[PDB]
Amino acid sequence: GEQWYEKFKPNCLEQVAIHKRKLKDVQEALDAMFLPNAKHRILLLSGPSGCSKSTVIKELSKILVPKYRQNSNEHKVTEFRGDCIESFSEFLKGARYLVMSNLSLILIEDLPNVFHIDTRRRFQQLILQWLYSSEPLLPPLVICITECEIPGIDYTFSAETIMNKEILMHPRLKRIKFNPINSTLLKKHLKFICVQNMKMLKEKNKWNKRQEVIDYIAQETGDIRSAITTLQFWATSSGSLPESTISYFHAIGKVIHGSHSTNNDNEMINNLFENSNNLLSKEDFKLGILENYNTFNKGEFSISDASSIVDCLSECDNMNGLPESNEYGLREVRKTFRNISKQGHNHGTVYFPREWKVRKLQNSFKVQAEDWLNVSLYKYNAVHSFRNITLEFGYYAPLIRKCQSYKKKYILDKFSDIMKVENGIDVVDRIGGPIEALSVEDGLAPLDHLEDQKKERDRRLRMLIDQY
Amino acid sequence: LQLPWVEKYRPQVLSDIVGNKETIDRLQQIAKDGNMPHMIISGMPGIGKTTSVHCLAHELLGRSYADGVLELNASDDRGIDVVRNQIKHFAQKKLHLPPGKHKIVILDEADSMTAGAQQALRRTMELYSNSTRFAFACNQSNKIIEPLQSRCAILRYSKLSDEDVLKRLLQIIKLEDVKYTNDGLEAIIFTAEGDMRQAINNLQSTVAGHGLVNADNVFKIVDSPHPLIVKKMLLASNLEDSIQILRTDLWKKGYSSIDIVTTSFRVTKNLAQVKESVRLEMIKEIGLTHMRILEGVGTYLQLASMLAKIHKLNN
Amino acid sequence: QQPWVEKYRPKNLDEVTAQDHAVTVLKKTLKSANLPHMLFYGPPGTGKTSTILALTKELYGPDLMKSRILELNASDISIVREKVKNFARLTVSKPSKHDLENYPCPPYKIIILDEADSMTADAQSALRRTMETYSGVTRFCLICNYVTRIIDPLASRCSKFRFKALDASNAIDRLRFISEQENVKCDDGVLERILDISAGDLRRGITLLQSASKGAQYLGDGKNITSTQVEELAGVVPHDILIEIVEKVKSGDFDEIKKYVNTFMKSGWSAASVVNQLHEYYITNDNFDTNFKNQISWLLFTTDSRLNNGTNEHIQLLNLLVKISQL
Amino acid sequence: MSLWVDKYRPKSLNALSHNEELTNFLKSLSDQPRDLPHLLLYGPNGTGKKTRCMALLESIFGPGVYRLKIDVRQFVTASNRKLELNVVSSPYHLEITPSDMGNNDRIVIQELLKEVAQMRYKCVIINEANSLTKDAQAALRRTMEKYSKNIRLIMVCDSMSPIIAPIKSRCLLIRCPAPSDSEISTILSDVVTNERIQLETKDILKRIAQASNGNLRVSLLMLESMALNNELALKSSSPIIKPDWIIVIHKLTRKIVKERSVNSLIECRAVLYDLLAHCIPANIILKELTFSLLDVETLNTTNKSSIIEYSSVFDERLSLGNKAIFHLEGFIAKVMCCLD
Amino acid sequence: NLPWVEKYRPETLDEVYGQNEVITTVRKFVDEGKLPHLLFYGPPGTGKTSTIVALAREIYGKNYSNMVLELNASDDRGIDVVRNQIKDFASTRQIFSKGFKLIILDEADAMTNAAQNALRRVIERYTKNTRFCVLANYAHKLTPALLSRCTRFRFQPLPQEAIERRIANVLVHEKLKLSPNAEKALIELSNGDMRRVLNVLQSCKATLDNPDEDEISDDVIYECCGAPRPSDLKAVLKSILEDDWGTAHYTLNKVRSAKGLALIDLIEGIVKILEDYELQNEETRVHLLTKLADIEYSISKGGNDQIQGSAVIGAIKASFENET
Numbered sequence A: 001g002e003q004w005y006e007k008f009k010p011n012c013l014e015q016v017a018i019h020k021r022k023l024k025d026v027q028e029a030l031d032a033m034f035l036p037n038a039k040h041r042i043l044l045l046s047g048p049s050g051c052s053k054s055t056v057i058k059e060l061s062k063i064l065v066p067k068y069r070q071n072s073n074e075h076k077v078t079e080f081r082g083d084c085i086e087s088f089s090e091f092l093k094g095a096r097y098l099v100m101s102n103l104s105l106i107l108i109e110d111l112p113n114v115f116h117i118d119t120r121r122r123f124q125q126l127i128l129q130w131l132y133s134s135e136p137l138l139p140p141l142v143i144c145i146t147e148c149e150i151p152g153i154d155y156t157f158s159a160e161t162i163m164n165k166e167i168l169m170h171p172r173l174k175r176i177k178f179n180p181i182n183s184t185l186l187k188k189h190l191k192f193i194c195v196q197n198m199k200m201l202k203e204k205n206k207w208n209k210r211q212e213v214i215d216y217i218a219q220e221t222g223d224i225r226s227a228i229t230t231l232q233f234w235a236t237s238s239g240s241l242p243e244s245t246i247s248y249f250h251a252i253g254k255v256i257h258g259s260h261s262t263n264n265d266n267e268m269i270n271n272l273f274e275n276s277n278n279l280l281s282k283e284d285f286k287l288g289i290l291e292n293y294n295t296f297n298k299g300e301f302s303i304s305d306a307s308s309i310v311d312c313l314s315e316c317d318n319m320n321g322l323p324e325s326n327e328y329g330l331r332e333v334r335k336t337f338r339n340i341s342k343q344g345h346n347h348g349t350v351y352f353p354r355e356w357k358v359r360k361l362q363n364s365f366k367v368q369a370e371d372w373l374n375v376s377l378y379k380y381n382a383v384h385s386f387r388n389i390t391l392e393f394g395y396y397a398p399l400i401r402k403c404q405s406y407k408k409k410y411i412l413d414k415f416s417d418i419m420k421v422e423n424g425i426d427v428v429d430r431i432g433g434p435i436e437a438l439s440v441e442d443g444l445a446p447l448d449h450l451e452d453q454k455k456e457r458d459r460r461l462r463m464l465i466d467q468y
Numbered sequence B: 001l002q003l004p005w006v007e008k009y010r011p012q013v014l015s016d017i018v019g020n021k022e023t024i025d026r027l028q029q030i031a032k033d034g035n036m037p038h039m040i041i042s043g044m045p046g047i048g049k050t051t052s053v054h055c056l057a058h059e060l061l062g063r064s065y066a067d068g069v070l071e072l073n074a075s076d077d078r079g080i081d082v083v084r085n086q087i088k089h090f091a092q093k094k095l096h097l098p099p100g101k102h103k104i105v106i107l108d109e110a111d112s113m114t115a116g117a118q119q120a121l122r123r124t125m126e127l128y129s130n131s132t133r134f135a136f137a138c139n140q141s142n143k144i145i146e147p148l149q150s151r152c153a154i155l156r157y158s159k160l161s162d163e164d165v166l167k168r169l170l171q172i173i174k175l176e177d178v179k180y181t182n183d184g185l186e187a188i189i190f191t192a193e194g195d196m197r198q199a200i201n202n203l204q205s206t207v208a209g210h211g212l213v214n215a216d217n218v219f220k221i222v223d224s225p226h227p228l229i230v231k232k233m234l235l236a237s238n239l240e241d242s243i244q245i246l247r248t249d250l251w252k253k254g255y256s257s258i259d260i261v262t263t264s265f266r267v268t269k270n271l272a273q274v275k276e277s278v279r280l281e282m283i284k285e286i287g288l289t290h291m292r293i294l295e296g297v298g299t300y301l302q303l304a305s306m307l308a309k310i311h312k313l314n315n
Numbered sequence C: 001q002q003p004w005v006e007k008y009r010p011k012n013l014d015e016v017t018a019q020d021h022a023v024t025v026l027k028k029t030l031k032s033a034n035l036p037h038m039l040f041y042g043p044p045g046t047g048k049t050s051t052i053l054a055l056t057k058e059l060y061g062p063d064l065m066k067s068r069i070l071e072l073n074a075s076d077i078s079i080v081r082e083k084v085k086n087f088a089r090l091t092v093s094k095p096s097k098h099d100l101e102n103y104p105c106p107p108y109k110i111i112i113l114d115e116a117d118s119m120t121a122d123a124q125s126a127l128r129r130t131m132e133t134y135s136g137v138t139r140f141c142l143i144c145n146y147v148t149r150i151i152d153p154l155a156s157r158c159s160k161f162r163f164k165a166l167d168a169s170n171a172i173d174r175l176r177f178i179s180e181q182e183n184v185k186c187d188d189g190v191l192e193r194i195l196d197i198s199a200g201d202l203r204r205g206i207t208l209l210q211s212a213s214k215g216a217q218y219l220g221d222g223k224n225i226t227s228t229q230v231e232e233l234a235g236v237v238p239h240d241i242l243i244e245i246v247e248k249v250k251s252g253d254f255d256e257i258k259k260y261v262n263t264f265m266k267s268g269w270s271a272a273s274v275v276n277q278l279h280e281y282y283i284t285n286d287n288f289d290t291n292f293k294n295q296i297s298w299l300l301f302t303t304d305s306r307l308n309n310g311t312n313e314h315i316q317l318l319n320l321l322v323k324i325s326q327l
Numbered sequence D: 001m002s003l004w005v006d007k008y009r010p011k012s013l014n015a016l017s018h019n020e021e022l023t024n025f026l027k028s029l030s031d032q033p034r035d036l037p038h039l040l041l042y043g044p045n046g047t048g049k050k051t052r053c054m055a056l057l058e059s060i061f062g063p064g065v066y067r068l069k070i071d072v073r074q075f076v077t078a079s080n081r082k083l084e085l086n087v088v089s090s091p092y093h094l095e096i097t098p099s100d101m102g103n104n105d106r107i108v109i110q111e112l113l114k115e116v117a118q119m120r121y122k123c124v125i126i127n128e129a130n131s132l133t134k135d136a137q138a139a140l141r142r143t144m145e146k147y148s149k150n151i152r153l154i155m156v157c158d159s160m161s162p163i164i165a166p167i168k169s170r171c172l173l174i175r176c177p178a179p180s181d182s183e184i185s186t187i188l189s190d191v192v193t194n195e196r197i198q199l200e201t202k203d204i205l206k207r208i209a210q211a212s213n214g215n216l217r218v219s220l221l222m223l224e225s226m227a228l229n230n231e232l233a234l235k236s237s238s239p240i241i242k243p244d245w246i247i248v249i250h251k252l253t254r255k256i257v258k259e260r261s262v263n264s265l266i267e268c269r270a271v272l273y274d275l276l277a278h279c280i281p282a283n284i285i286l287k288e289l290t291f292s293l294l295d296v297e298t299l300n301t302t303n304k305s306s307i308i309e310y311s312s313v314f315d316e317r318l319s320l321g322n323k324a325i326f327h328l329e330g331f332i333a334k335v336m337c338c339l340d
Numbered sequence E: 001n002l003p004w005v006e007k008y009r010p011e012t013l014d015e016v017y018g019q020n021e022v023i024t025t026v027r028k029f030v031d032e033g034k035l036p037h038l039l040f041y042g043p044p045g046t047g048k049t050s051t052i053v054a055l056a057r058e059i060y061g062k063n064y065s066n067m068v069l070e071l072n073a074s075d076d077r078g079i080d081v082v083r084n085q086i087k088d089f090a091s092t093r094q095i096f097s098k099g100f101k102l103i104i105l106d107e108a109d110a111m112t113n114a115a116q117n118a119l120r121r122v123i124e125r126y127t128k129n130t131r132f133c134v135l136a137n138y139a140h141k142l143t144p145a146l147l148s149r150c151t152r153f154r155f156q157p158l159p160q161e162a163i164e165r166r167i168a169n170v171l172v173h174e175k176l177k178l179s180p181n182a183e184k185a186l187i188e189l190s191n192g193d194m195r196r197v198l199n200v201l202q203s204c205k206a207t208l209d210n211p212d213e214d215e216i217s218d219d220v221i222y223e224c225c226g227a228p229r230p231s232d233l234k235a236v237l238k239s240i241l242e243d244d245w246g247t248a249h250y251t252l253n254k255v256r257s258a259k260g261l262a263l264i265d266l267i268e269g270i271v272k273i274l275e276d277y278e279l280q281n282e283e284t285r286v287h288l289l290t291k292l293a294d295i296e297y298s299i300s301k302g303g304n305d306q307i308q309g310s311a312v313i314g315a316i317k318a319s320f321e322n323e324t
């Protein structure tokens, strides 16, 4: 019945699941805080779940509190509970006495009912009063916040929404942001828990296949507690426990090639819809059909059938995702392909839609167009619209600049303006690349260079600003 | 006065539960394992989510079911503080139990509530984690914050389907001694749309208000458009007869255009004599009519045009 | 300065022309000292707004009126409902001695919802509920064009006033008087052209006259308004271009029609205006038989529907012209 | 140096050379800055509407509006999302293109106009006003009704039909016809004289203007490209450099006319994805494809009529659709079926 | 004085007609006196509110004011205010402390789902002290839980003879004169809803110059309801069917301008009138319906009104050409 992570909770500061950089930064900040003439009174840690926020604080406190305690144990962290049945103010007033020989770190992981506006205002006022307190001798205050949202305070409960601007940018408040545990540390901790449970693992004969699952756990999430719970559940369970691409392949094949177990189109359509509604609800399915219908008879069918299929797909698209649209489209596809099926099925490779690649290329084109617009504005005092860039300046201007640069290089006042072209900050290649064709995405590629392109654009913008 | 039929004879063991066989098998293997982790149940309500949780509690605890189970709506009192107080009073109560087994708390309807109180519930679970295991019921898994799903295991359920709905209705009628006919059960299943609770409520209402369970008797109480009338209207050989049926039996009875088109689509989805081409053409026409209605033109002329197009298709 | 529409609005009730029945009924209601909910309907630009404003000015007075009168367009339901509730809940200010000396200021406020027919059924039901809640202290005046668009429960709660379309004589006299007062020099047929373009709507006619006067003032020439400037301001394609388009359609050659349309699209004239002018030319012509008009009506309707969805004007116009040429 | 398109761009109302009546009207309007109304210039793309707006602003506020700066003003959407739209601003006026946003353009317009009004008057230039959403147009109407005193609107559009009636009533409509071939040739000849480009014959400028199809911007771009590619010495046999995507569409038209098969349909669909990846609007692609098909001399009247019907129908489908590929492929398939 | 809707509201269950089944079913509750949760659903203006009020008056008696709280789910104040009012009325100690308390909630179907779950929770909380009679139009839009917590009662449409006799009752208690054509038009427009019938009758009486010696006519009823007059629609149809294009266009425009008749309303009226026509070829009906539906859909999105009217005329003419 007892849980594993509680049994094997960290005992020292060396087995804490957190990166060394964050641990060192927190330790240094906390040590500087304990100094008599400290600069921060409240230490605010804010991060996602399972980041060892309170655990690291407790481990550091166990060694730090005795150092600064004055002459007059187990009261290292006087944590406050948000379900104690105005309590926060009384707790603050009581902790105020916990100074000198009564030194005790204060930890506020659990927060009070801050949903109502009045409660949030009271909490903010109390925090501001604590920060404005003139008492030279005050106890440490540590506030740990876990970030979560469900896409205002209702939408998100991050640090930004919990305290006002005066506290967010307070000159005497240190805010630290944690990071999820990396794969290596999680794997190390999981294998340590294993090394501990070797006895039961050998008794159940699961020692040989532990490495086959641990990696998956380490690759699932960076939450130490959740990973340990999952490992314990897997070790305890005697069964086998853990797709979309296979379902997509089967659905596309049944829609186009058709099923053999059931000869009734209506029954197959109804069963497929009932069993798999989410897969067909997404618009991409239609695109997939458009990308896969030509595979029927390796494209050896009359153009009339293809025209009818495409017209139906367009009509279904115009229906704006109604339940009848998918029914109608699939029934057209099945009926059309059944009338020209010779004897059997030729299960060709299923190709995913190319829409995602087109969207990525469009995003890259937009980034390049923005960079070109910035360069034009900051080097020639010219402003052009996005449509003009896509239609007119996308091709003409790069060609002109390339010709001018080639002439400049060949030469080195008939060409005086030509040599003024600066190779470094002038676009000479057509924006978006040559317009030749786009190949089919045979590979899975369920889905970055966009971030690198944006960084490059920012660097060029800074260079132009320096020039300007 | 009289209690609802559904609550009177709710299933007591996982065997009676039907549908989502893989999830039932997972619950059974968890029960026989003797160690029960946290759950996040998701699915459209009325498919034995809460009932499955209570049946799992039955199979796990047994005699201490009433002393180790607490169902909370989480919004009855419009306050999370009182919910936390109740959870504290329940968990903190000292009851000796055999090793391994832990108390079970069900927090129903966690999807109609904000993220901050989800974090508060996560903190409460973390504090009371060695004695109580939580089963968060919700309608959407993604709505629950990421930490909650990371901590717990997600259980995805789906509709019970007509076969199992009919099966449970046969047992309910057998134990209730209710006179029934096949068309009545078909009508009950059609109105239920996969919801067991709705099916049982409709059956109870039909048995109370009327006697023999017939389609006419069932729809005298359901109040939804009659599928047979819609089928006759759609399959009427002559256009004028279909128009008259639509005007009299449907339009003058107050039925909305959206309901009429939905019933027509549902009827067309299941037909026998209509050819596949005719069926899909009718589906296309119904879909266009639905799109037109949803955009603002919810008038009778749209339904008349749909009927005329359907009749032209049948020619 | 100020738009001529509000500047030259009728002051009192007797200044409203060609509205004898509605004006007389309104005066009878005013004398009765009981103001029920009002629903004004009629073709646009007939003085409904002017009539209601004159009625209010004769009830509260020139100074007090501004406190008891609210005006809303009823377009886009929560917002308008909130503004109406806020206005109604506000306590009525105290009338002054002068206000009570010559005006029998009723103890209620008036809210005028223009374009009431554009509201949906749910919006009209919400408005009816708001009226019922605040019927004691608030009187509503719904201005619309078609009374049939108002749901029966809402319509039954308001006394209805029908406004007749203004005759050409009254509109032309009004425009002439405005022009003389504002010192506007126009050629013969300019005012009639403005009336024809506005389809009898005096609001649009006055706006177009003001725009033409501004253009003439900018020109700096003799400042004699010409029909060409009025059509240019109103966006009406010249009649000669329409005649050439009709001749090309009669020719029937696809290539010639395509070239003419390509040349026309460079002028910038809107295709909707061309479609409307072609509809007017064809429907009201005695040289075409019944079948030709049957077909042209549907063709023009389809082209207008396609254009209203945000489609390429060139393609739609070319398709329409090709279809008409093939009739 | 600066491109010839921008190098010789007129910077004053006196530098204009075509549509002299419009120039005189603008000069008269600038003579009384106080009573400047809200202007709506409508006309074909590339005619010089923006140039006329700039000239009017220079005449009114003086030669200071040509100094422009770009600012990234971020805002919050309805769904609490961070939106970014760049704004081009001058000391006396500002330029915004709400069409770059899309459906969520009302919020940006409202925020920008309110901020500008809060800070004689400032001129807001609404680029691509024809593509604004109806709710955005209603918000504009509200701003005109409220903040007319401090904000003056100068909206330039390709088409006037999409503009709602109240905006037309409240604004001064001005048509901007495309320049004639002779005027384009004269402008190109002036550029040639200023650039020392040898011309064997003057018909080169006429051919360039004809190829541009009334677009002065594109005509100047072709002139510059050909001059640079021909060692600053044009000849009668010098090729006309057309947009690359136009040539791609012409190749697609030839392929469709020649090969009418399913594999040809797949290849054309791939070409369509390639064209779309370069941010070319679907409607523009459809229009260019239809007009290239209609220019084929081997097609009869019935084929042309069917092609134009299908183009109109599929343009309507594109307007009310979500994915452009479906409608373009359907149009191509219908054209192939009718031709075959 | 008081609106005729409440002035003539039934005082006892014996005054409820056309709903004999539900009336006899509920006649047991007044005798026994134990009232469980109820759910009255049916088309509007059939007596659900009248029935519940009569039952409450018969049960409680003179304590109706302090033992019956009537609320509307579509009130101007937020639904949270309605929940707070219900909570205040239920929690407060019973002044008389005799029997349960009744809360009559109306237009419950219009609520959102979450509001319906909230109502179900409130019902569960105060089961022993408060009894709820949910009044709605259709039960199918209610959540299954609320439906299960309440006993269903369906109100059938009122018989036409009942409406006739109630109209005669109103016209005899109120010194008002109504012509047979006017009464027929009022019944047709109401579609069985008694609320609208009474409201229209009261409005028509108000519009009458001297109600003591003046009689209401069908024209008065149509003006009060603001509905298209059948005579105008028939004249427009006759002009379209038996006159040239100029005459038909002029007649349509004149009628629409001088009667404030929208194009959509004219199309619906013409379709309703034509449904009674005896056609020879069945394709004529299909063409008429399809073309008119397309025209109405286009009008819903706006466009040119003159072109739309000409399209209606041409569609009617072309469709009727098939008759010969």
Ligand SMILES: Nc1ncnc2c1ncn2[C@@H]1O[C@H](COP(=O)(O)OP(=O)(O)OP(=O)(O)O)[C@@H](O)[C@H]1O
Pocket: A005, A006, A008, A009, A010, A015, A016, A017, A048, A049, A050, A051, A052, A053, A054, A055, A056, A109, A144, A146, A189, A224, A225, A228, B126
């Ligand atoms: N190696 C480990 N490192 C960190 N925590 C561990 C480890 N092993 C077990 N745990 C337990 O996992 C949980 C993670 O620590 P802690 O709760 O302080 O982090 P957190 O992310 O701030 O938590 P919460 O989401 O509850 O606010 C604690 O219960 C800790 O006892």
Ligand SMILES: Nc1ncnc2c1ncn2[C@@H]1O[C@H](COP(=O)(O)OP(=O)(O)O)[C@@H](O)[C@H]1O
Pocket: B006, B007, B009, B010, B011, B016, B017, B018, B019, B044, B045, B046, B047, B048, B049, B050, B051, B052, B160, B168, B196, B197
């Ligand atoms: N498979 C089933 N067999 C029998 N009863 C069921 C089944 N599914 C749902 N029910 C009925 O639905 C009610 C609640 O079930 P459930 O859906 O788990 O809770 P909720 O409706 O609150 O989501 C129970 O009273 C039960 O009788």
Ligand SMILES: Nc1ncnc2c1ncn2[C@@H]1O[C@H](COP(=O)(O)OP(=O)(O)O)[C@@H](O)[C@H]1O
Pocket: C004, C005, C006, C008, C009, C010, C015, C016, C017, C018, C019, C043, C044, C045, C046, C047, C048, C049, C050, C143, C174, C202, C203, C206
């Ligand atoms: N009956 C009338 N008598 C005098 N002027 C009128 C009349 N009707 C309209 N007008 C003129 O038309 C202009 C605008 O009227 P408008 O507000 O459009 O009326 P409505 O709101 O009824 O359409 C006013 O300035 C007014 O001078």
Ligand SMILES: Nc1ncnc2c1ncn2[C@@H]1O[C@H](COP(=O)(O)OP(=O)(O)O)[C@@H](O)[C@H]1O
Pocket: D005, D006, D008, D009, D010, D015, D016, D017, D018, D044, D045, D046, D047, D048, D049, D050, D051, D052, D156, D187, D216, D217
């Ligand atoms: N009157 C003119 N004389 C010379 N060049 C012009 C004239 N009008 C426009 N141009 C040229 O056209 C180019 C683009 O015009 P633009 O302002 O984009 O027109 P639009 O606003 O219609 O798109 C400019 O670079 C400018 O050089």
Ligand SMILES: Nc1ncnc2c1ncn2[C@@H]1O[C@H](COP(=O)(O)OP(=O)(O)O)[C@@H](O)[C@H]1O
Pocket: E004, E005, E006, E007, E008, E009, E010, E015, E016, E017, E018, E019, E043, E044, E045, E046, E047, E048, E049, E050, E166, E194, E195, E198
């Ligand atoms: N069953 C009935 N018997 C007699 N009168 C009725 C009946 N139903 C409705 N009415 C009449 O209709 C008017 C309003 O009824 P209403 O309270 O709206 O019923 P519901 O709430 O069912 O719509 C009443 O004044 C009443 O005279």
Ligand SMILES: [Mg+2]
Pocket: A053, A054, A055, A109
């Ligand atoms: Mg923690």
